[PDB]
Structures are given as structure tokens and as C-alpha cells.
Amino acid sequence: GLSDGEWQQVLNVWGKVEADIAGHGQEVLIRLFTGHPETLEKFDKFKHLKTEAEMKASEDLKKHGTVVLTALGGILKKKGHHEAELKPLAQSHATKHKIPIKYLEFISDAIIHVLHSKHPGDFGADAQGAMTKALELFRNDIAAKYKELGFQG
Ligand code: HEM
Numbered sequence: 001g002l003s004d005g006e007w008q009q010v011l012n013v014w015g016k017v018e019a020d021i022a023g024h025g026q027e028v029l030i031r032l033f034t035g036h037p038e039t040l041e042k043f044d045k046f047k048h049l050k051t052e053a054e055m056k057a058s059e060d061l062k063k064h065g066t067v068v069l070t071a072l073g074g075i076l077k078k079k080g081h082h083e084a085e086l087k088p089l090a091q092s093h094a095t096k097h098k099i100p101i102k103y104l105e106f107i108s109d110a111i112i113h114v115l116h117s118k119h120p121g122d123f124g125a126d127a128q129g130a131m132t133k134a135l136e137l138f139r140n141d142i143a144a145k146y147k148e149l150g151f152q153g
Contacts, residue, residue: 002133007079009130014076016119025065030055031110039103076134090145100153101143108135
């Protein structure tokens with residue numbers, strides 16, 4: 001798992017996100033959708049977004065970004081003790097949304113990218129290490145739930 005020092009770094013970085021949850025959420029989803037157009041197809045309600053300008057102008061996309069990052073923030077603040085929070089998310093993503101774990105890898109990478117893009121020179125090597133560990137733990141615990149369900153895609 002993560003050390004206490006690493007968790008402290010994770011939650012310090014997260015303060016940056018909390019100052020502008022909607023803006024961070026929007027940028028994360030736009031990074032995801034533009035880098036990996038197949039991901040947009042999992043969202044019946046975002047399929048109409050044919051350009052990045054349309055994505056940027058979408059208030060509902062910002063809303064979803066807020067929902068996503070709020071859930072992730074709640075999980076991170078549990079510092080790994082997140083079974084109750086994570087299980088239902090894993091299960092809704094496997095059974096209802098059909099989100100392959102690959103897409104969770106994509107969004108994890110997007111979060112790291114957005115942190116650097118919005119805070120260049122202010123997301124240090126130690127902080128990236130810690131946040132990466134936290135996102136890997138999140139993804140890995142979801143992966144265990146996916147395996148339980150036999151879900152691949
Ligand atoms: C940090 C990772 C993610 C978190 C914390 C997260 C969180 C959430 C939450 C809280 C909801 C609403 C409740 C629910 O349905 O369980 C949701 C809905 C949804 N998510 Fe995720 N999500 C993540 C990643 C992804 C990815 C990578 C995709 C697709 C590539 C995705 C696709 C969807 C879809 C299609 C819905 C339903 C949207 C709607 O039509 O209202 N999610 N997500």
C-alpha cells in the first residue's frame with residue numbers, strides 16, 4: 001500500500017483539485033474523450049459531442065466531471081480503506097456501464113496529465129509518485145471486483 005507520507009502527498013495534491021473540481025473534472029474527461037474516442041461511446045449522453053469545442057461548451061460534461069472527481073476524492077480520503085465506497089462503483093461500472101479496466105487506466109493517466117497541465121512546475125516528482133500509487137491502488141481494487149464478476153468488456 002501507500003505509506004502515511006505518501007497518503008499525505010496524495011491528499012495535498014487533491015487540494016488542488018478541490019479548489020476547482022468542475023474545471024479539473026471537465027479537463028480530465030476531455031483528455032479522455034479526445035485521446036480515446038472509443039470512451040465517448042460508453043456515454044449515450046455525450047455521443048453528440050462531435051468536437052472538442054462542443055465538449056468544452058457542455059455544461060453536462062462539467063457536471064459529470066464533478067460527479068466523477070467527487071467520488072474519487074471520497075475514495076482517496078479513505079486512504080485505502082475504501083471497500084464500501086469502491087465495491088459499488090466497480091460493480092456499476094462492470095455490470096451497467098460496461099467500462100473495461102483499460103478505460104480506467106486511460107482516465108488515471110488523464111488525471112496525471114491534467115495535474116501537470118493545470119499546475120506546471122507545481123506537481124513534484126514525489127507528488128506524482130504518490131498520486132500514481134493511489135490511482136493504481138484504486139484501479140487494482142476495481143480489477144479484483146471485475147475478476148470476481150468475470151467482466152472484461
Ligand atoms: C476515476 C474513475 C471514475 C470514477 C470515480 C467514476 C465515477 C462515477 C460515478 C460516481 C457515476 C454515477 C454513479 C454510478 O453510475 O455508479 C458514474 C457514472 C458513469 N460513468 Fe464512471 N467513473 C470513473 C471512470 C469512468 C470511465 C473511464 C468511464 C468511461 C470510459 C465511465 C463511464 C461512466 C458512465 C457511462 C456513467 C453513467 C453516466 C450517465 O449516463 O449518467 N466512468 N461514474
